[PDB]
Design a protein around this ligand. Structure first.
Ligand SMILES: O=CCc1ccccc1
Ligand SMILES: O=CCc1ccccc1
Ligand SMILES: [Cu+2]
Ligand SMILES: [Cu+2]
Ligand code: NA
Ligand code: NA
Ligand code: NA
Ligand code: NA
Lengths: 620, 620
């Protein structure tokens, strides 16, 4: 009955039938995105209308369409033809991954480049990479992918160990033309294999690890009702799933006495970008938006009990659409479990004689996605004490190149002849805030150092200052680790028992933001990534920091366009966008398969409760 | 047989007998510090000599002494009379904690101040706080403690809820005189209790938490030999314990093939300081050095199975001396166990069809200490992939004051009338490095942004730069989160298979350092805390960043004095000192007992291995 329930196979079958009957899903059409729309603000009228947004691609060159359908009424609500030169191309289709390799395999220029290298075309894998927007006027309005080549010596070989540097091709995947083949010279193809399951490389496997057994003899402490409504240790929320964003959290709230208090209306990772810092023309165009261009949710892994998720695991199996509108289940695509998290609070008192210890725990909601060489785990954590934390785990295989004789300032060496270009992994969290309701404000909090003098005669005092962000034009903020900068989201109309506004404090990791020159193409297309924090006024159609159609969009869409409206955000329905990322100078230890590295953020209560909220936790 | 074994009860009994026979331990003497000395550099002569350093206090006013004894030869090696006005007072004795309350209880000025407040002297607890060095000329060369008062309504009451503001006393604990009683005015004593085990405050305890069972059916994967030598998943180390520093790690090394490769010779938390930022004269002198002034190791808790440490736990029970030279066991004072740590590495490859997942784990070595209101957990972590991490967990009860009518810029309100002054918790990790041996250097690594232009026509390139620190005068470094600043400790004479120096990268949390005015007393006594990183040349007697005798020392001792020698550190036996801390603006949720907050640092291999070191981990 909940409007926030996961999409069902039946709903997706209905969408397909509706589009087919309307003449919108003929043999030349492909569904490039399908997703359920969130209820509009103020859905307290009990009028459920399950609506789906669809992006429809046409493989014969006709204009794509954006379509909204209602499955409750079985109708097409709206249907719009898209001018992709203006508003951007549609996301990459899975079925296009192989088209780039296949088109190059018959192009004379491609074949001549491989022949000069004595490479058999049947052994050459081509990575299908997004094109971006650069200097090539012939690409405007066309659907372009760029291809970089890797050799697979045998079917089970890791191609990433054998990059073919000095060579790149551009392909129009709709007209099926190879527009350019660029060959800047021959590099040796690195010869060592990178097969991390080969006994020659691993040596004998360790026999020293004894098992760790994690069980819950009475089952887990959380309940799931309605398919995706979670209640755990006074928390409640709905777990959604979208093919673009992946796991989405709705209606995060905390049961404080008899009051269910909202905290966050919608939480998601709304974009991610991986910009490469190698100035070689073979790769200087390389920036992929895994969320916006490829849709991370459709590549979610099926997670294996005892390997990917350990303990008493409850699974969700979300349903998405394939390119023809058929429902497809991602079996065991979301793990949910609780974890012990050490000591929560502890004190031994010299005067009362009381010794007190309580243990902490967290609820874990996670999925894993794979797009080409990279793999990412997305983890949401809820803690007993009201903290909310997000963590990204990056692993997989680093993207490789040749390592040039004489070295490089932008590439590190991993093995003889084998390089890995410098790059970043940058995420955008979209936090539709609802601290005790929708009237919220953001304050920037800095430490204040004080001068020794009158009123501070011993020079020990220090303080803090809070600046309210009142309009969107002043709500584009930078981190400052040196001054301990944080941001507080408060409700000025809801006060704690000390008559102070209730609030939550956002703690960032203060990692570097986008490094590229501010005049670059990527700085214009990923403008969100140049600043740590943005605050906008909520609006239904302002969903992604990069806009709706990221692929081959020329720039400026999303957050820079939103904040130009300069809307009031002081005690209003607001959205926080936090940029956070890893800057990756690859090390030898990242090869041939990368141990996990992590980045994230957390929010902690800041006078939201009237005292510690975990006084009622038992001794265990 | 190991020279790094824990001190035994028999060794401490021998020290006592040796000091007694030498005439050094009469009835007026107290042992204020006793600890085993580390083997000198180059102990490859097989000549074991177990030596102990002792600080001897005299309760009758005679000069204290520093004494070194050899238990192997049963002799006093050296004995030096200390001039405490010059070099600092001895650490606070546990038996002095109660002397301050007892002396004030008969002082007419103290009694008049309590009578004006209608407080019964039998209900007034007095916190024994270290004095520091300020403007009081009469305190030079005397052993002073300062007292702040708290009311206990009944024997099991939490006194911290009832601070008596506007009142402070100074006491000479050797001559047993109250030197000053300062009363700046009457504040209401906050009335609400803070008894976090009272059902009136906790409400009914949750019944919703189901048990989590963590077991190791075949036992743990690590072995302990010789009392304190650990081997775990190619790591080996010795776990030491010192009454001042707490847990100390010796000879951290990693078994790479057939070679045992050293990484860190000695790791410890060598100092910590809690400076308060309240300019009230009642508290503007308040800075305690828990390690240097109070000795955190002697207040280590006994850790309870299933409450403090969960899983298959192996305990160590270190032995220390009491004030009379008797051995005293800290039963179960150190927990050791391994923990599952999620995914280690994962990749699903589109071209090879191979799906690969491995799980991570870490070894945990921890102890907990309690000094007055504050409790701290110290956690050392070793990971499968070569990472070393330290984590401090801060909990307990915040130090309180009145909250003034009309508010405060330096105190936050926790309850009606109840304040908590702003303060920091700052730690110093001393890392005696030994990356593949003792010839080490430190490089500072910054991200380098590049301008769009020739050689970077698309404005995407970025790079990094490394600066070698060659002498101590240039090795006092500040964090820079914006440029992703890290520090690399490398061995220029030991190269990986790519002919690059092996190394480890130190990742800091980049939290604010000491906030106090640089002309303050605390900035001079805790000078280490004003900078994030220091590098010194190793020397036997350069143990603490604050010097040997922190209590009432006038300033400048330790690191600022060491680095003035301006010694060569480029490919030498070096020591890294990393400052890291929490800046604490207390929140309502910290009251009446604080949920854990954390800070720390980690070191990751940086071309130390020839490839990932966890390729031989099995599928489980
Ligand atoms: O992450 C998207 C870029 C990509 C896609 C497919 C193969 C390699 C790289
Ligand atoms: O942490 C050392 C300061 C202190 C010691 C004893 C009681 C309260 C405060
Ligand atoms: Cu990376
Ligand atoms: Cu604190
Ligand atoms: Na355009
Ligand atoms: Na909002
Ligand atoms: Na002095
Ligand atoms: Na060293």
């Amino acid at each position: 009955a909940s409007p926030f329930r996961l999409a069902s196979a039946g709903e997706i079958s209905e969408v397909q039938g509706i589009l087919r009957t309307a003449g919108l899903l003929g043999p030349e059409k492909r569904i490039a995105y399908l997703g359920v729309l969130d209820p509009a603000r103020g859905a307290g009228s009990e009028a459920e209308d399950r609506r789906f947004r669809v992006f429809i691609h046409d493989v014969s060159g006709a204009r794509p369409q954006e379509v909204t359908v209602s499955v409750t009424n079985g109708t097409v609500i709206s249907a719009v033809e898209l001018d992709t030169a203006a508003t951007g191309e549609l996301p990459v289709l899975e079925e296009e991954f192989e088209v780039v390799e296949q088109l190059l395999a018959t192009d004379e220029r491609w074949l001549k480049a491989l022949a000069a290298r004595n490479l058999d075309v049947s052994k050459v894998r081509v990575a299908p990479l997004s094109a971006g927007v650069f200097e090539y006027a012939e690409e405007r309005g066309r659907r372009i992918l760029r291809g970089l080549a890797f050799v697979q010596d045998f079917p089970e070989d890791s191609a990433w160990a054998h990059p073919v540097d000095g060579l790149v091709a551009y392909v129009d995947v709709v007209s099926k033309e190879v527009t350019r083949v660029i060959d800047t010279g021959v590099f040796p193809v690195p010869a060592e294999h990178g097969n991390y399951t080969d006994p020659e490389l691993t040596g004998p496997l360790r026999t020293t690890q004894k098992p760790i057994s994690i069980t819950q003899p009475e089952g887990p402490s959380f309940t799931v009702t309605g398919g995706n409504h979670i209640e755990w240790e006074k928390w409640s929320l709905d777990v959604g799933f979208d093919v673009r964003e992946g796991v989405v959290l709705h209606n995060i709230a905390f049961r404080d006495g008899d009051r269910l208090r909202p905290i966050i209306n919608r939480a998601s990772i709304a974009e991610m970008v991986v910009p490469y810092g190698d100035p070689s023309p073979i790769r200087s165009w390389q920036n992929y938006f895994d969320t916006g261009e490829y849709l991370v949710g459709q590549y979610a892994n099926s997670l294996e009990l005892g390997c990917d998720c350990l303990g008493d695991i409850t699974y969700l199996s979300p349903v998405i659409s394939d390119a023809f509108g058929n429902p497809r289940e991602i079996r065991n695509g979301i793990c949910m479990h609780e974890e012990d998290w050490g000591i929560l609070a502890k004190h031994s008192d010299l005067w009362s004689g009381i010794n007190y210890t309580r243990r902490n725990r967290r609820m874990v909601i996670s999925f894993f996605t794979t797009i080409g060489n990279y793999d990412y785990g997305f983890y949401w954590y809820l803690y007993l004490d009201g903290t909310i934390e997000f963590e990204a785990k990056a692993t997989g295989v680093v993207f490789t190149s040749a390592f040039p004789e004489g070295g490089s300032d932008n590439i590190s060496q991993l093995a003889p002849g084998l390089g890995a270009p410098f790059h970043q992994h940058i995420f955008s969290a979209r936090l539709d805030m609802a601290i005790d309701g929708f009237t919220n404000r953001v304050e920037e909090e800095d430490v204040v150092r004080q001068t020794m003098g009158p009123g501070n005669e011993r020079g020990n005092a220090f303080s803090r200052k809070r600046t309210v962000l009142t309009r969107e034009s002043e709500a584009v903020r930078e981190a400052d680790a040196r001054t301990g900068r944080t941001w507080i989201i408060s409700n000025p109309e809801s006060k704690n028992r000390l008559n102070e506004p209730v609030g939550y404090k956002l703690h960032a990791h203060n990692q570097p933001t986008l490094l590229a020159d501010p005049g670059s193409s990527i700085a214009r297309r990923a403008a969100f990534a140049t600043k740590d924090l943005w605050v906008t006024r909520y609006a239904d159609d302002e969903r992604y920091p990069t806009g709706d159609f990221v692929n081959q969009h020329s720039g400026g869409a999303g957050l820079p366009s939103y904040i130009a409206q300069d809307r009031d955000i002081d005690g209003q329905d607001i959205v926080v966008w936090h940029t956070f990322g890893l800057t990756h100078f690859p090390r030898v230890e990242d090869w041939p398969i990368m141990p996990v590295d992590t980045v994230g953020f957390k929010l902690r209560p800041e006078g939201f409760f009237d005292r510690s909220p975990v006084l009622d936790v038992p001794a265990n």
